[PDB]
Design a protein around this ligand. Structure first.
Ligand SMILES: CCCCCCCCCCCCCCCCCC(=O)OC[C@H](COP(=O)([O-])OCC(O)COP(=O)([O-])OC[C@@H](COC(=O)CCCCCCCCCCCCCCCCC)OC(=O)CCCCCCCCCCCCCCCCC)OC(=O)CCCCCCCCCCCCCCCCC
Ligand SMILES: CCCCCCCCCCCCCCCCCC(=O)OC[C@H](COP(=O)([O-])OCC(O)COP(=O)([O-])OC[C@@H](COC(=O)CCCCCCCCCCCCCCCCC)OC(=O)CCCCCCCCCCCCCCCCC)OC(=O)CCCCCCCCCCCCCCCCC
Ligand SMILES: CCCCCCCCCCCCCCCCCC(=O)OC[C@H](COP(=O)([O-])OCC(O)COP(=O)([O-])OC[C@@H](COC(=O)CCCCCCCCCCCCCCCCC)OC(=O)CCCCCCCCCCCCCCCCC)OC(=O)CCCCCCCCCCCCCCCCC
Ligand code: HEC
Ligand code: HEC
Ligand code: HEM
Ligand code: HEM
Ligand code: HEM
Ligand code: HEM
Ligand SMILES: COc1cc2[nH]c(C)c(-c3ccc(Oc4ccc(OC(F)(F)F)cc4)cc3)c(=O)c2cc1Cl
Ligand SMILES: COc1cc2[nH]c(C)c(-c3ccc(Oc4ccc(OC(F)(F)F)cc4)cc3)c(=O)c2cc1Cl
Ligand SMILES: [Mg+2]
Ligand SMILES: [Mg+2]
Lengths: 243, 88, 360, 243, 88, 360
């Protein structure tokens, strides 16, 4: 084997010390997940209540949850039933178990995407490149059905078909849709979903690292205050020279 | 263990509005690929030359994956420099 | 115990020419304290049950107030424990401190082994892919010793019973370490500390306030750098595969441990024999321990000053440091015949430098 | 309320320090559980392998396990299936959940009997008395359907119908069956099932308590050996009296 | 926390064989109950007397549970003394 | 530390008329040791997860080799901890040991409170019916203090988060106790021990071998009685309802704690007011602590001999002992107006005897 190529550095807004997530783009990436990726991928750690006040308002999240049928029970007779979703429910999964997922995808398992940007090298840059790396095979490489060639996937042979194509959904804010736009948006959503506490973490760090730095200066002055009394000291042997 | 690792000295670009809103219905990668394909021409020729050497061999062995990977990696790195200028 | 406190931290006299190379013992101690505080706090919400361990860590970060801070501080500070220890040990080899501080050196070596074992136990607890497959491998290098493996796990494989007992051991060992720190200090203050010039001198002053303020200044830098890395993530100290659930029937594409174990993992990788690689491990520790008796290995009377200043032949400790750095690079690379050739070149330097330190 | 009456003391063989379980009676009580009690009660902590070499031989336990249909899976297609039982399986439960159990027993839940003799006061004596305590109600007490009068059950009103009646099963060893015989046998089985390690525990204790006692005698002699030199000591003031 | 608590000075009885094996198809409690019912007669009379006092009251109140429980507890304790002699 | 070992356990001189009433301090210490050994061993296979805690204890007994021995030894020895402490405290009240061994008495009282809290934490861990409902009640008597309850549980009810943190605290507190035992011994050997007659005397002999062999003889009896009860089950020390899984919507018919908490649970049950019952708790502890200053409460010079021998007026400690026994019976009974009347009679004696001990 060989070392895979390092992906390029895209200028995502969140990459700076002083920056937050880009929420308008996080919203559009959630439409892309719901209408394209959710057909094969689960996000089992996310719950609808996580979106309230951080991405979408409460009344809008309720409408999205209620459009799904969720299993609950047991009832008084010891049976199972279905009901519309509520804020407390988790994102719905497309398959009940892993064996059923592989059976529907030719033996390949689509991984859970709850921590996906923390679970790959280079994270979001890798995901952006992957989504636009499908090419025709090179001379001398023939792939059997169910496999596709990709620049950035280790080994080049991936079992996921190209998920994106120009013009396929209509954003709600009017932004024109294309493969590159959807890629940038879905990456932002999945980066936020990997750790929604990123903004709280960074804002607290700025307050702390700045305070500690100032105290470090003060302690430096207090140390040199005592350093000078012995660095300027005079010791004479035999007789006194100068006062 | 982190969603991303922060970076120093990143150039955040300014959005370039289009002329007709219907223009951005096609991927703006098509406008940047030709120029990026000319700057990586040193690898376009190494790939075309390796195909001839493989088409001529008698046995059914040989491939061009090595040269092909280097070529398209060069192009993707050239596109990344400016792609976000045309995305909201 | 207050007369002991003032005798050893207030009126204790020290040479005037001390500098920051003599401050890293305090920093290591403070890292232990921080780990004990954050560790106990994490234990209030951790679950050793294998079927739910991985989930308990994520729920801790995603749902609990300030849960991200205690998790990320515990992980970052562990890296600073090993960096401080490395600088601490290197000062001793530069100044031949073990010449007359013999039992201080030996006691320190025991503390180093205790810290290695503690860190290894803690890395298995989050129960991701790297947790499982790194424990499976590192516990097979000990296979030459008979029956030293199936019992520590209590099963035919790194199962759910191993995880329960690694939690208890990880809980306990740090407090045993705190006991041995007391012995370490006993053997040091028996003789008194050395100084950068390697000479005896009567130009000494009391610890408080002059020397106490240098320790305090260094503490500030440590706390600021830990929080900087913890809250912003500038360096990549953890592997991404540990964010994936365990799978017993799928090995990850690249297995590599934490950076502070990489160098010796590379040495053991370029030696093909499995029994010969473990003998190499013992010989290295034996060499470090034998330095406690360096005075007796030659009848010529030794000196503490080693004369590295302006010297073009350098010193053995410096040559070792660069061989270790070179091997960290090899350990992080995909196996390839060329990498293996150079890795063996560096392994010879890594080992020979240790042996020749016993010569003078 | 009032304190319930204390049950009488029946002479079970196991009650002595030096005694083991009565295995011939444990075997017959397992037939009673399988053919009468198992219709309403689960024993979820017991597994077929627990019976091998301690109550029944291996080849006989296999035949009993195979007479049940056990659910297993998922298969390669992500579906569930059934198969005959094996030594590794648990005793089968009659209901899937607690809500289904109450629905079939008029709202009352038959408790799990895996630790039953450790979970009631007086244990086996209580269970023996309970099983033979059904009586007609006294003057002035009228019970609604689904309740029955019992001498020993707290409050006297129990929702379990009388489970035993003379002549209902045929033991395999030829012992004649009657209500009292079945009661004694089913109690022995359930006492063993509450802790199968009882015999190992008692036999180890005899070896230990006897050894420790002997060492206590030896230490008593060693103590009095040193006690006598100061208990027989003479101290005189002024002048010496006797040698 | 124990399946049972061991006891001292327990009398373990000897089995009494029957005459016809078909005799033990009926519960041997029937043979011991008459004798045990005569020894608890002090409570048989307190129960019969409490029924008359309740049958005579005008309102629909009163019961005999107290006397009834004491009576049948006395009998069960008398049966336990010997029941295991007839059980294998 | 070997000069300290021989100074305090070999050459230490003691009065010749010591007897078994002075051996129960050693026995308590040995019970702590046994609990630490068996406790750590149980921790290797225990699960704090509420949904699986109850099952992990049963699987430990039913499947693991020797699992029954460590479980039953830990449960039995806990009862012997409190019996030894009770005899230990009663000797002091019979001989007025707190007259001159003041800080030894106070330090002991702190150890007693630490042991009470430890036992309460451990009884919730098996997670049966009595675990849940006993914690719910005993944690409501502290309701008068504002917000002292919802935080210790970390929820709106004794949920699964309370169980995780009770495990960590239970793990830690015994080792803190071992630290305070060192202080306890410091304050004792400062003054020296008393003797049954209450006199000063020069007829003393060395601890080893004469007095060391009495401690050893008593240890034999302790180990034999623990194993007798553990392996045969002669007494009923645990409640059967804790062999039933938790049910949050079904309260058991009779809620009663362990025997060593019953007496004071009865006192608090016969007092109808909830705030007045907790004040009664503080006053009792305050009375025990005030005995450290008994010399100063009257200008007459006190004596250690209390003259209970052949005395028809008895002594206050004896009258207290029987009032405690009487209340253990009331606490184990079903509520009934008649039981409540006599329970209040005994409560008056239980409290008044404490107060009059400060008079002479
Ligand atoms: C012919 C061919 C020949 C070829 C030859 C080729 C080879 C050449 C030779 C070999 C060369 C290499 C040798 C090896 C290297 C080491 C050599 C050496 O020993 O040097 C001696 C040299 C002098 O030693 P020294 O005089 O004893 O001073 C050191 C004392 O310890 C200092 O003691 P102190 O701590 O008590 O400080 C005293 C002093 C301060 O002293 C200094 O500042 C001195 C520093 C060096 C100054 C260098 C100036 C050079 C320019 C010329 C001189 C200036 C003009 C002077 C005019 C004088 C007029 C009278 O205090 C004050 O003045 C008052 C308070 C201000 C200080 C407090 C500042 C706090 C900042 C915030 C802290 C935040 C905490 C962390 C939070 C997280 C992160 C944000 O030491 C150094 O300079 C060491 C520097 C170490 C820095 C570590 C941290 C680096 C962080 C880097 C981050 C990434 C930056 C990336 C770049 C872009 C950023 C935007
Ligand atoms: C404004 C615009 C922006 C720009 C401005 C900057 C912006 C950034 C922010 C501001 C930054 C500056 C702020 C002001 C700073 C004021 C304070 C200051 O200057 O601090 C320096 C000051 C220096 O101390 P000093 O008392 O002045 O002098 C001590 C003498 O130097 C001790 O010497 P001695 O003679 O007494 O003892 C003998 C021996 C005794 O031994 C020791 O002391 C221990 C060993 C020392 C050597 C350390 C290296 C060995 C360890 C290797 C670790 C490997 C890591 C593994 C991972 C590898 C991954 C690949 O020590 C030595 O030999 C020391 C000399 C070492 C020279 C190294 C030369 C390197 C040459 C490289 C050549 C490269 C060639 C290829 C080039 C290719 C490209 C062309 O240190 C402190 O005050 C320490 C404060 C922080 C405490 C540590 C807490 C953090 C822990 C992590 C960091 C660990 C390293 C820290 C330094 C350790 C020094 C011993
Ligand atoms: C062969 C056929 C079968 C038959 C044979 C037997 C078969 C069975 C097996 C063999 C059995 C025998 C084998 C040979 C044994 C050889 C050794 C021997 O004789 O041992 C005695 C021997 C006596 O010691 P000593 O040095 O000779 O003399 C000490 C002086 O007596 C200390 O006196 P002092 O003047 O120097 O100190 C003053 C004061 C200083 O205070 C103390 O020393 C501490 C307090 C002592 C009093 C203890 C009671 C207070 C605690 C109450 C606990 C309540 C529990 C809560 C639960 C309640 C549940 C309802 O102490 C006293 O006042 C002590 C006198 C107490 C007299 C109690 C009178 C009770 C009267 C009851 C009247 C009842 C009326 C109603 C009747 C109704 C029916 C008609 O003790 C030992 O050698 C101890 C070895 C075992 C260590 C303990 C390990 C087990 C821990 C659990 C048991 C705790 C109690 C243990 C006794 C504590 C004594 C202080
Ligand atoms: C079914 C038609 C799928 C749809 C729709 C999406 N994905 Fe998927 N994905 C699928 C499979 C079968 C696989 C396994 C590929 C293999 O060869 O093993 C994947 C994999 C991924 C990955 C992991 C890549 C890696 O390096 O391991 C990612 C990050 C991923 N898929 C993302 C993703 C996104 C963003 C989608 C919506 C745009 C999406 N997938 C849709 C199957 C299917
Ligand atoms: C359904 C017809 C049942 C059969 C067959 C058996 N049991 Fe049962 N049992 C059943 C119910 C509905 C209840 C609850 C009673 C109530 O009022 O709550 C019970 C209860 C028990 C108990 C618990 C008694 C107690 O003190 O709580 C025991 C010990 C018990 N049952 C034992 C038992 C035995 C030995 C059986 C076979 C002989 C048996 N039961 C059959 C329902 C049914
Ligand atoms: C938990 C780990 C350790 C702690 C807390 C610790 C602590 C300390 C402290 C506080 C000092 C005095 C201050 C100083 O010189 O920095 C010291 C000195 C010393 N330590 Fe460490 N140490 C640890 C590990 C080690 C190790 C691993 C070694 C060597 C293998 C070692 C060897 C020494 C020596 C030789 C000295 C004396 C240096 C001299 O005076 O020349 N210690 N230690
Ligand atoms: C020198 C002392 C210690 C070191 C070096 C150390 C190291 C580590 C490391 C490397 C991890 C894995 C972090 C990760 O990748 O997630 C870890 C996890 C953990 N440690 Fe520590 N530890 C120390 C002390 C303690 C103590 C004293 C406790 C408890 C008393 C503790 C409790 C835990 C727990 C519960 C975890 C699991 C949570 C997690 O993985 O994030 N640690 N430790
Ligand atoms: C004076 C010291 C101690 C006392 C009085 C004590 C008391 C108790 C008690 C009463 C129980 C409940 C037993 C039951 O009913 O099942 C228990 C359980 C437990 N204790 Fe201890 N304990 C002590 C020390 C320790 C220590 C030091 C540890 C661990 C380091 C420990 C670990 C455990 C565990 C894991 C359990 C749960 C298992 C069980 O309930 O059987 N204990 N303890
Ligand atoms: C873990 C709990 C305890 C331990 C390990 C312990 C240990 C000891 C030991 C070894 C002795 C000397 C031998 C003896 O007299 O028995 C002693 C004496 C003493 N203890 Fe304790 N003790 C504990 C709790 C207590 C408590 C609860 C009290 C009182 C509230 C107390 C008060 C005293 C006093 C007053 C003495 C001196 C008796 C005299 O010389 O007259 N101790 N203790
Ligand atoms: C001249 O200067 C030096 C020489 C030094 N020599 C040696 C041999 C070591 C050392 C000791 C123990 C150790 O522990 C090990 C952990 C893990 C393993 O195995 C594996 F695979 F890595 F996990 C093997 C081993 C790893 C490395 C040093 O630190 C060291 C430091 C300095 Cl300054
Ligand atoms: C004159 O001689 C004596 C007087 C004594 N006086 C008192 C007050 C106590 C005592 C102290 C603390 C304590 O702690 C408590 C645990 C639990 C609770 O609450 C509840 F509900 F029980 F759990 C209340 C409280 C329980 C009891 C003694 O031991 C004691 C012993 C002797 Cl010899
Ligand atoms: Mg020499
Ligand atoms: Mg006075």
């Amino acid at each position: 084997e060989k070392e895979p190529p390092h992906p390029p550095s895209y200028p995502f807004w969140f990459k700076s010390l002083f920056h937050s997530h880009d929420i308008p783009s996080v919203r559009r990436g959630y439409e892309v997940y719901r209408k394209v990726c959710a057909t094969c991928h689960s996000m089992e750690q996310l719950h609808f209540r996580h979106l309230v006040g951080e991405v979408l308002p409460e009344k809008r999240v309720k409408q999205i949850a209620a459009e799904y049928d969720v299993t609950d029970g047991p009832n008084d007779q010891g049976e199972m039933y279905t009901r519309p979703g509520i804020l407390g429910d988790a994102f719905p999964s497309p398959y009940p178990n892993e064996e059923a997922a592989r059976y529907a995808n030719g033996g390949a398992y689509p991984p859970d995407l709850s921590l996906i940007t923390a679970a790959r090298h280079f994270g979001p840059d890798y995901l952006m490149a992957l989504l636009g790396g499908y090419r025709d095979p090179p001379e001398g490489v023939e792939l059997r059905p169910g496999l596709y060639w990709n620049v950035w996937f280790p080994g080049n042979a991936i079992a996921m078909p190209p998920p994106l194509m120009d013009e396929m959904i209509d954003y709600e804010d009017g932004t024109p849709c294309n493969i590159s736009q959807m890629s940038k948006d879905v990456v932002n959503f999945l980066t936020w979903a990997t750790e929604p506490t990123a903004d709280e973490r960074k804002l607290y760090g700025l307050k702390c690292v700045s305070a500690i730095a100032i105290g470090t200066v003060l302690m430096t002055l207090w140390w040199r205050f005592y350093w000078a009394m012995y660095a300027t000291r005079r010791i004479d042997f035999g007789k006194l020279k100068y006062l | 263990s982190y969603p991303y690792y922060c970076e120093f000295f990143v150039k955040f670009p300014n959005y370039i509005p289009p002329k007709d809103p219907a223009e951005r219905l096609v991927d703006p990668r098509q406008k940047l690929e030709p120029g990026c394909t000319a700057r990586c021409s040193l690898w376009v020729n190494e790939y075309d030359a390796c195909t001839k050497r493989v088409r001529a061999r008698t046995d059914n062995k040989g491939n061009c994956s090595g040269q092909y990977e280097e070529l398209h990696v060069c192009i993707d790195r050239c596109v990344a420099k400016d792609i976000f200028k045309y995305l909201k | 115990f207050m007369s002991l406190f003032r005798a050893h931290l207030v009126f204790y006299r020290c040479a005037l020419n001390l500098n920051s190379s003599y401050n890293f013992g305090f920093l290591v101690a403070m890292t232990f304290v921080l780990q004990i505080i954050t560790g106990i706090t994490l234990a209030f919400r951790y679950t050793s049950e294998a079927s739910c361990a991985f989930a308990s860590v994520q729920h801790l970060v995603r749902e609990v107030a300030a849960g991200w801070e205690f998790r990320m501080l515990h992980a970052t500070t562990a890296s600073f424990v090993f960096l401080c220890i490395l600088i601490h040990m290197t000062r001793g080899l530069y100044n031949w401190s073990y010449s007359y501080l013999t039992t201080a050196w030996m006691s320190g070596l025991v503390l180093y082994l205790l810290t290695i074992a503690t860190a290894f136990l803690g890395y298995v607890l989050p129960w991701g892919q790297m947790s499982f497959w790194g424990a499976t491998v590192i516990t097979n290098l000990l296979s030459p010793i008979p029956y030293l493996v199936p019992w520590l796990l209590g099963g035919y494989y790194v199962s759910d019973v191993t995880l329960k007992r690694f939690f208890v051991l990880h809980f306990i060992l740090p407090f045993i370490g705190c006991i041995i720190i007391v012995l370490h200090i006993f053997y040091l203050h028996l003789n008194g500390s050395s100084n950068p010039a390697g000479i005896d001198t009567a130009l000494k002053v009391a610890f408080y306030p002059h020397m106490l303020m240098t320790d305090a200044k260094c503490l500030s830098y440590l706390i600021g750098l830990i929080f900087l890395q913890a809250a912003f993530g500038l360096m990549e100290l953890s592997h991404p595969d540990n964010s994936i659930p365990v799978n017993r029937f799928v090995t990850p594409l690249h297995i590599v441990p934490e950076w502070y174990f990489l160098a010796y993992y590379a040495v053991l990788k370029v030696i093909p024999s499995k029994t010969g690689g473990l003998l190499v491990f013992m010989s290295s520790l034996i060499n470090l321990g034998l330095l406690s008796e360096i005075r007796a290995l030659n009848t010529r009377m030794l000196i503490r000053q080693q004369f590295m200043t302006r010297n073009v032949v350098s010193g053995w400790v410096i040559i070792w440091v660069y061989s270790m750095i070179f091997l960290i690079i090899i350990g992080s690379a995909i196996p390839q015949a060329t990498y293996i050739l150079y890795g063996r070149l560096a392994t010879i330097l890594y080992l020979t430098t240790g042996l020749v330190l016993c010569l003078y």
